[model samples]
Target: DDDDILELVNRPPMSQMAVPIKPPESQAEQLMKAKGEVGVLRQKLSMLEKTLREHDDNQKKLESSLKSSHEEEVTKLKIELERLEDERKFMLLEQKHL
Candidate 1:
Protein backbone atom coordinates (compact mmCIF):
# COMPACT_ATOMS: atom_id res chain seq x y z
CA ASP A 1 0.00 0.00 0.00
CA ASP A 2 2.79 2.51 0.82
CA ASP A 3 4.69 1.78 -2.41
CA ASP A 4 1.53 2.39 -4.50
CA ILE A 5 0.83 5.69 -2.70
CA LEU A 6 4.43 6.88 -3.21
CA GLU A 7 4.28 6.10 -6.91
CA LEU A 8 1.03 8.06 -7.37
CA VAL A 9 2.39 11.12 -5.47
CA ASN A 10 5.65 11.15 -7.50
CA ARG A 11 3.79 11.31 -10.87
CA PRO A 12 3.37 14.71 -12.68
CA PRO A 13 0.19 16.74 -12.15
CA MET A 14 -2.64 16.48 -14.73
CA SER A 15 -2.79 20.24 -15.42
CA GLN A 16 0.94 20.52 -16.10
CA MET A 17 0.80 17.55 -18.46
CA ALA A 18 -2.29 18.80 -20.34
CA VAL A 19 -1.36 22.52 -20.66
CA PRO A 20 2.21 23.58 -21.58
CA ILE A 21 3.54 27.06 -20.84
CA LYS A 22 4.40 29.27 -23.81
CA PRO A 23 7.08 31.97 -23.80
CA PRO A 24 5.98 35.52 -24.68
CA GLU A 25 7.08 36.99 -28.04
CA SER A 26 9.49 39.95 -28.05
CA GLN A 27 8.38 43.41 -29.19
CA ALA A 28 11.06 43.53 -31.89
CA GLU A 29 9.82 40.28 -33.41
CA GLN A 30 6.24 41.54 -33.60
CA LEU A 31 7.32 44.88 -35.02
CA MET A 32 9.42 43.22 -37.68
CA LYS A 33 6.53 40.97 -38.72
CA ALA A 34 4.13 43.90 -38.96
CA LYS A 35 6.64 45.97 -40.92
CA GLY A 36 7.11 43.16 -43.45
CA GLU A 37 3.38 42.82 -44.06
CA VAL A 38 2.96 46.61 -44.41
CA GLY A 39 5.85 46.85 -46.86
CA VAL A 40 4.29 44.19 -49.11
CA LEU A 41 0.92 45.94 -49.17
CA ARG A 42 2.54 49.33 -49.80
CA GLN A 43 4.50 47.97 -52.77
CA LYS A 44 1.34 46.53 -54.30
CA LEU A 45 -0.56 49.77 -53.87
CA SER A 46 2.25 51.80 -55.41
CA MET A 47 2.40 49.52 -58.45
CA LEU A 48 -1.38 49.69 -58.95
CA GLU A 49 -1.39 53.47 -58.78
CA LYS A 50 1.47 53.72 -61.26
CA THR A 51 -0.33 51.44 -63.72
CA LEU A 52 -3.55 53.44 -63.47
CA ARG A 53 -1.75 56.71 -64.08
CA GLU A 54 0.00 55.33 -67.16
CA HIS A 55 -3.29 54.08 -68.56
CA ASP A 56 -4.98 57.43 -68.07
CA ASP A 57 -2.13 59.34 -69.70
CA ASN A 58 -2.07 56.96 -72.68
CA GLN A 59 -5.83 57.35 -73.17
CA LYS A 60 -5.56 61.12 -73.23
CA LYS A 61 -2.69 61.06 -75.71
CA LEU A 62 -4.56 58.71 -78.04
CA GLU A 63 -7.69 60.84 -77.98
CA SER A 64 -5.75 63.99 -78.83
CA SER A 65 -3.87 62.26 -81.65
CA LEU A 66 -7.11 60.93 -83.16
CA LYS A 67 -8.75 64.34 -83.08
CA SER A 68 -5.83 65.97 -84.87
CA SER A 69 -5.72 63.24 -87.51
CA HIS A 70 -9.44 63.56 -88.21
CA GLU A 71 -9.17 67.31 -88.58
CA GLU A 72 -6.33 67.00 -91.10
CA GLU A 73 -8.23 64.45 -93.19
CA VAL A 74 -11.38 66.59 -93.20
CA THR A 75 -9.46 69.67 -94.39
CA LYS A 76 -7.89 67.75 -97.26
CA LEU A 77 -11.25 66.33 -98.37
CA LYS A 78 -12.92 69.78 -98.24
CA ILE A 79 -10.21 71.32 -100.48
CA GLU A 80 -10.63 68.51 -103.05
CA LEU A 81 -14.45 68.94 -103.02
CA GLU A 82 -14.18 72.69 -103.69
CA ARG A 83 -11.73 72.17 -106.58
CA LEU A 84 -14.07 69.64 -108.25
CA GLU A 85 -17.05 72.05 -108.01
CA ASP A 86 -15.08 74.88 -109.67
CA GLU A 87 -13.93 72.61 -112.54
CA ARG A 88 -17.50 71.43 -113.21
CA LYS A 89 -18.78 75.02 -113.37
CA PHE A 90 -16.04 76.00 -115.85
CA MET A 91 -16.79 73.04 -118.13
CA LEU A 92 -20.52 73.88 -118.23
CA LEU A 93 -19.81 77.51 -119.25
CA GLU A 94 -17.44 76.42 -122.09
CA GLN A 95 -20.10 73.99 -123.46
CA LYS A 96 -22.72 76.77 -123.49
CA HIS A 97 -20.40 79.01 -125.60
CA LEU A 98 -19.98 76.16 -128.10
Candidate 2:
Protein backbone atom coordinates (compact mmCIF):
# COMPACT_ATOMS: atom_id res chain seq x y z
CA ASP A 1 0.00 0.00 0.00
CA ASP A 2 2.99 2.34 -0.42
CA ASP A 3 1.21 3.17 -3.72
CA ASP A 4 -1.52 4.84 -1.60
CA ILE A 5 1.08 7.37 -0.41
CA LEU A 6 1.16 9.02 -3.89
CA GLU A 7 -2.18 10.81 -3.15
CA LEU A 8 -0.50 12.31 -0.05
CA VAL A 9 2.28 13.84 -2.20
CA ASN A 10 -0.17 14.55 -5.08
CA ARG A 11 2.57 13.82 -7.57
CA PRO A 12 2.27 13.12 -11.31
CA PRO A 13 1.93 9.41 -12.16
CA MET A 14 4.54 9.31 -14.94
CA SER A 15 7.35 11.92 -14.70
CA GLN A 16 7.25 15.63 -13.95
CA MET A 17 9.98 18.06 -13.03
CA ALA A 18 9.69 19.88 -9.73
CA VAL A 19 12.02 22.48 -11.18
CA PRO A 20 12.67 22.78 -14.92
CA ILE A 21 15.10 25.15 -16.52
CA LYS A 22 15.06 25.16 -20.30
CA PRO A 23 18.39 24.86 -22.09
CA PRO A 24 19.29 26.79 -25.25
CA GLU A 25 16.91 25.49 -27.97
CA SER A 26 18.80 26.88 -31.00
CA GLN A 27 20.69 24.40 -33.19
CA ALA A 28 23.48 26.84 -34.04
CA GLU A 29 23.84 27.98 -30.42
CA GLN A 30 23.80 24.34 -29.22
CA LEU A 31 26.75 23.47 -31.45
CA MET A 32 28.55 26.65 -30.37
CA LYS A 33 27.97 25.77 -26.74
CA ALA A 34 29.24 22.21 -27.35
CA LYS A 35 32.36 23.53 -29.11
CA GLY A 36 33.08 25.88 -26.20
CA GLU A 37 32.67 22.96 -23.79
CA VAL A 38 35.19 20.94 -25.79
CA GLY A 39 37.66 23.83 -25.59
CA VAL A 40 37.18 24.08 -21.81
CA LEU A 41 37.70 20.34 -21.34
CA ARG A 42 40.77 20.41 -23.55
CA GLN A 43 42.27 23.22 -21.44
CA LYS A 44 41.57 21.30 -18.25
CA LEU A 45 43.14 18.12 -19.68
CA SER A 46 46.23 20.05 -20.78
CA MET A 47 46.60 21.52 -17.30
CA LEU A 48 46.17 18.05 -15.80
CA GLU A 49 48.95 16.70 -17.97
CA LYS A 50 51.17 19.58 -16.89
CA THR A 51 50.30 19.07 -13.21
CA LEU A 52 51.21 15.38 -13.41
CA ARG A 53 54.65 16.33 -14.70
CA GLU A 54 55.10 19.13 -12.17
CA HIS A 55 56.75 16.71 -9.77
CA ASP A 56 57.60 13.65 -11.81
CA ASP A 57 60.53 12.65 -9.58
CA ASN A 58 58.35 12.10 -6.49
CA GLN A 59 54.83 10.82 -7.01
CA LYS A 60 54.26 10.32 -3.25
CA LYS A 61 54.98 14.00 -2.73
CA LEU A 62 52.55 14.84 -5.51
CA GLU A 63 49.77 12.91 -3.75
CA SER A 64 50.44 14.62 -0.43
CA SER A 65 51.14 18.12 -1.67
CA LEU A 66 48.22 20.51 -2.06
CA LYS A 67 50.25 23.04 -4.00
CA SER A 68 47.64 23.17 -6.76
CA SER A 69 43.98 22.15 -6.45
CA HIS A 70 44.01 20.82 -10.01
CA GLU A 71 47.09 18.68 -9.31
CA GLU A 72 45.49 17.19 -6.18
CA GLU A 73 42.42 16.03 -8.09
CA VAL A 74 44.56 14.72 -10.97
CA THR A 75 46.61 12.63 -8.54
CA LYS A 76 43.47 11.08 -7.08
CA LEU A 77 42.14 10.31 -10.55
CA LYS A 78 45.49 8.82 -11.59
CA ILE A 79 45.46 6.53 -8.54
CA GLU A 80 41.89 5.48 -9.33
CA LEU A 81 42.81 4.70 -12.95
CA GLU A 82 45.78 2.59 -11.81
CA ARG A 83 43.47 0.66 -9.46
CA LEU A 84 40.91 0.10 -12.23
CA GLU A 85 43.63 -1.16 -14.60
CA ASP A 86 44.83 -3.68 -11.97
CA GLU A 87 41.26 -4.89 -11.46
CA ARG A 88 40.77 -5.14 -15.22
CA LYS A 89 43.87 -7.30 -15.46
CA PHE A 90 42.53 -9.62 -12.77
CA MET A 91 39.21 -9.89 -14.57
CA LEU A 92 41.02 -10.70 -17.81
CA LEU A 93 42.91 -13.49 -16.08
CA GLU A 94 39.63 -14.86 -14.75
CA GLN A 95 38.20 -14.75 -18.27
CA LYS A 96 41.15 -16.72 -19.62
CA HIS A 97 40.68 -19.34 -16.92
CA LEU A 98 36.97 -19.61 -17.71
Candidate 3:
Protein backbone atom coordinates (compact mmCIF):
# COMPACT_ATOMS: atom_id res chain seq x y z
CA ASP A 1 0.00 0.00 0.00
CA ASP A 2 2.76 2.40 0.98
CA ASP A 3 4.99 1.57 -1.97
CA ASP A 4 3.78 4.26 -4.33
CA ILE A 5 3.06 6.69 -1.48
CA LEU A 6 6.58 6.43 -0.12
CA GLU A 7 7.98 6.64 -3.65
CA LEU A 8 6.32 10.02 -4.04
CA VAL A 9 7.18 11.31 -0.56
CA ASN A 10 10.74 10.01 -0.31
CA ARG A 11 11.80 10.88 -3.85
CA PRO A 12 11.88 14.67 -3.76
CA PRO A 13 14.33 16.24 -6.17
CA MET A 14 17.74 16.79 -4.59
CA SER A 15 18.26 19.92 -6.73
CA GLN A 16 15.76 21.77 -4.50
CA MET A 17 18.16 21.55 -1.53
CA ALA A 18 20.00 24.91 -1.52
CA VAL A 19 22.49 23.80 1.08
CA PRO A 20 24.37 20.58 0.40
CA ILE A 21 24.80 18.50 3.59
CA LYS A 22 27.92 16.85 4.99
CA PRO A 23 26.08 14.00 6.74
CA PRO A 24 23.41 11.65 5.28
CA GLU A 25 21.65 11.11 8.64
CA SER A 26 21.16 14.83 9.23
CA GLN A 27 19.89 15.34 5.69
CA ALA A 28 17.37 12.51 6.03
CA GLU A 29 16.03 13.89 9.35
CA GLN A 30 15.64 17.45 8.04
CA LEU A 31 13.97 16.27 4.84
CA MET A 32 11.50 14.07 6.70
CA LYS A 33 10.59 16.88 9.12
CA ALA A 34 9.79 19.34 6.35
CA LYS A 35 7.92 16.80 4.24
CA GLY A 36 5.94 15.56 7.26
CA GLU A 37 4.51 18.99 7.98
CA VAL A 38 3.83 19.64 4.30
CA GLY A 39 2.16 16.24 3.83
CA VAL A 40 -0.13 16.87 6.81
CA LEU A 41 -1.29 20.17 5.35
CA ARG A 42 -1.81 18.66 1.91
CA GLN A 43 -3.89 15.89 3.41
CA LYS A 44 -6.06 18.44 5.21
CA LEU A 45 -6.61 20.40 2.01
CA SER A 46 -7.63 17.21 0.20
CA MET A 47 -10.21 16.42 2.87
CA LEU A 48 -11.61 19.95 2.71
CA GLU A 49 -11.86 19.75 -1.07
CA LYS A 50 -13.79 16.47 -0.89
CA THR A 51 -16.18 17.86 1.71
CA LEU A 52 -16.79 21.00 -0.34
CA ARG A 53 -17.77 18.99 -3.43
CA GLU A 54 -20.20 16.89 -1.42
CA HIS A 55 -21.69 19.97 0.21
CA ASP A 56 -22.27 21.71 -3.09
CA ASP A 57 -23.79 18.59 -4.62
CA ASN A 58 -26.15 18.14 -1.69
CA GLN A 59 -27.36 21.72 -1.91
CA LYS A 60 -28.00 21.56 -5.62
CA LYS A 61 -29.62 18.13 -5.47
CA LEU A 62 -31.97 19.16 -2.67
CA GLU A 63 -32.98 22.31 -4.44
CA SER A 64 -33.62 20.47 -7.69
CA SER A 65 -35.58 17.72 -5.96
CA LEU A 66 -37.85 20.22 -4.19
CA LYS A 67 -38.46 22.21 -7.33
CA SER A 68 -39.40 19.11 -9.33
CA SER A 69 -41.72 17.87 -6.59
CA HIS A 70 -43.48 21.26 -6.43
CA GLU A 71 -44.03 21.24 -10.18
CA GLU A 72 -45.51 17.75 -10.02
CA GLU A 73 -47.93 18.80 -7.28
CA VAL A 74 -49.02 21.84 -9.28
CA THR A 75 -49.65 19.68 -12.33
CA LYS A 76 -51.83 17.31 -10.30
CA LEU A 77 -53.76 20.20 -8.79
CA LYS A 78 -54.41 21.74 -12.22
CA ILE A 79 -55.75 18.42 -13.53
CA GLU A 80 -58.01 18.00 -10.52
CA LEU A 81 -59.38 21.55 -10.82
CA GLU A 82 -60.14 21.12 -14.54
CA ARG A 83 -61.96 17.86 -13.89
CA LEU A 84 -64.10 19.50 -11.20
CA GLU A 85 -64.98 22.40 -13.49
CA ASP A 86 -66.09 20.01 -16.25
CA GLU A 87 -68.28 18.06 -13.85
CA ARG A 88 -69.91 21.25 -12.55
CA LYS A 89 -70.75 22.40 -16.08
CA PHE A 90 -72.24 19.01 -17.02
CA MET A 91 -74.41 18.96 -13.86
CA LEU A 92 -75.71 22.48 -14.55
CA LEU A 93 -76.59 21.45 -18.16
CA GLU A 94 -78.49 18.35 -16.99
CA GLN A 95 -80.53 20.39 -14.50
CA LYS A 96 -81.39 22.96 -17.18
CA HIS A 97 -82.45 20.18 -19.68
CA LEU A 98 -85.05 18.83 -17.18
Candidate 4:
Protein backbone atom coordinates (compact mmCIF):
# COMPACT_ATOMS: atom_id res chain seq x y z
CA ASP A 1 0.00 0.00 0.00
CA ASP A 2 2.80 2.45 0.89
CA ASP A 3 4.72 1.71 -2.34
CA ASP A 4 1.58 2.17 -4.42
CA ILE A 5 0.91 5.61 -2.80
CA LEU A 6 4.51 6.76 -3.47
CA GLU A 7 4.28 5.80 -7.13
CA LEU A 8 0.98 7.68 -7.56
CA VAL A 9 2.42 10.88 -5.93
CA ASN A 10 5.60 10.83 -8.07
CA ARG A 11 3.73 10.31 -11.32
CA PRO A 12 3.70 13.32 -13.74
CA PRO A 13 0.51 15.37 -14.00
CA MET A 14 -1.77 15.02 -17.06
CA SER A 15 -1.37 18.75 -18.00
CA GLN A 16 2.03 20.45 -18.54
CA MET A 17 3.34 22.79 -15.84
CA ALA A 18 2.27 26.45 -16.09
CA VAL A 19 4.06 28.93 -18.36
CA PRO A 20 7.86 29.06 -18.02
CA ILE A 21 9.37 32.16 -16.44
CA LYS A 22 12.12 34.06 -18.30
CA PRO A 23 15.45 34.40 -16.51
CA PRO A 24 16.72 37.83 -15.38
CA GLU A 25 18.41 39.98 -18.07
CA SER A 26 22.19 40.51 -18.31
CA GLN A 27 23.96 43.71 -17.03
CA ALA A 28 23.76 45.40 -20.49
CA GLU A 29 20.03 44.81 -20.64
CA GLN A 30 19.65 46.28 -17.14
CA LEU A 31 21.65 49.38 -18.20
CA MET A 32 19.36 49.88 -21.19
CA LYS A 33 16.30 49.64 -18.96
CA ALA A 34 17.77 52.27 -16.66
CA LYS A 35 18.35 54.63 -19.59
CA GLY A 36 14.77 54.19 -20.74
CA GLU A 37 13.50 54.96 -17.24
CA VAL A 38 15.61 58.17 -17.14
CA GLY A 39 14.18 59.33 -20.45
CA VAL A 40 10.64 58.81 -19.19
CA LEU A 41 11.43 60.70 -15.99
CA ARG A 42 12.89 63.67 -17.89
CA GLN A 43 9.78 63.95 -20.05
CA LYS A 44 7.54 63.82 -16.98
CA LEU A 45 9.57 66.55 -15.29
CA SER A 46 9.29 68.85 -18.31
CA MET A 47 5.53 68.34 -18.46
CA LEU A 48 5.15 69.09 -14.76
CA GLU A 49 7.20 72.29 -15.12
CA LYS A 50 5.04 73.49 -17.97
CA THR A 51 1.88 72.80 -15.99
CA LEU A 52 3.27 74.68 -12.99
CA ARG A 53 4.08 77.71 -15.14
CA GLU A 54 0.57 77.78 -16.57
CA HIS A 55 -0.91 77.56 -13.08
CA ASP A 56 1.25 80.48 -11.94
CA ASP A 57 0.06 82.58 -14.84
CA ASN A 58 -3.56 81.73 -14.09
CA GLN A 59 -3.08 82.65 -10.44
CA LYS A 60 -1.80 86.09 -11.40
CA LYS A 61 -4.79 86.74 -13.65
CA LEU A 62 -7.25 85.67 -10.95
CA GLU A 63 -5.56 87.91 -8.41
CA SER A 64 -5.84 90.91 -10.71
CA SER A 65 -9.52 90.21 -11.32
CA LEU A 66 -10.20 89.87 -7.59
CA LYS A 67 -8.40 93.16 -6.89
CA SER A 68 -10.51 95.00 -9.47
CA SER A 69 -13.75 93.55 -8.10
CA HIS A 70 -12.81 94.50 -4.53
CA GLU A 71 -12.07 98.11 -5.59
CA GLU A 72 -15.44 98.43 -7.29
CA GLU A 73 -17.25 97.07 -4.24
CA VAL A 74 -15.43 99.57 -2.00
CA THR A 75 -16.44 102.49 -4.23
CA LYS A 76 -20.10 101.41 -4.20
CA LEU A 77 -20.09 101.07 -0.44
CA LYS A 78 -18.56 104.52 -0.01
CA ILE A 79 -21.31 106.12 -2.09
CA GLU A 80 -24.02 104.35 -0.11
CA LEU A 81 -22.44 105.47 3.18
CA GLU A 82 -22.35 109.13 2.04
CA ARG A 83 -26.01 109.04 1.06
CA LEU A 84 -27.01 107.67 4.46
CA GLU A 85 -24.96 110.31 6.27
CA ASP A 86 -26.62 113.15 4.30
CA GLU A 87 -30.11 111.82 5.07
CA ARG A 88 -29.30 111.69 8.77
CA LYS A 89 -28.16 115.36 8.76
CA PHE A 90 -31.33 116.47 6.97
CA MET A 91 -33.50 114.67 9.51
CA LEU A 92 -31.64 116.37 12.38
CA LEU A 93 -32.16 119.83 10.82
CA GLU A 94 -35.91 119.19 10.36
CA GLN A 95 -36.22 118.17 13.99
CA LYS A 96 -34.37 121.34 15.12
CA HIS A 97 -36.74 123.57 13.11
CA LEU A 98 -39.79 121.88 14.56
Whole-model lDDT values for every prediction: 0.90, 0.81, 0.88, 0.91
What is the TM-score (0 to 1) of candidate 2?
Answer: 0.39
Predicted candidate 3 versus true structure: per-residue lDDT over 1-68, tens digit per residue: 87877776545556766544455567779899899999999999999999999999999999999999
Over 1-98, each residue of candidate 1 has an lDDT whose tens digit, in order, gives: 58978887546677755654457779998899899999999999999999999999999999999999999999999999999999998899899973
Model 4 pairs whose backbones collide: none
Q: lDDT score, residue 49, model 4? A: 100
Highest TM-score model number: 1
Clash pairs (backbone) in predicted model 2: none
lDDT of 3 at 57: 100
For each candidate in turn, the TM-score is 0.61, 0.39, 0.59, 0.57
lDDT string for model 2 (1-98, tens) is 78787665645435554554566579988899899999999999999998888767477676556567778789999999999999999999999985
lDDT of 3 at 38: 100
Model 2, global lDDT: 0.81
- Candidate with more favorable, higher TM-score: 2 or 4: 4
Q: Whole-model lDDT, candidate 4?
A: 0.91
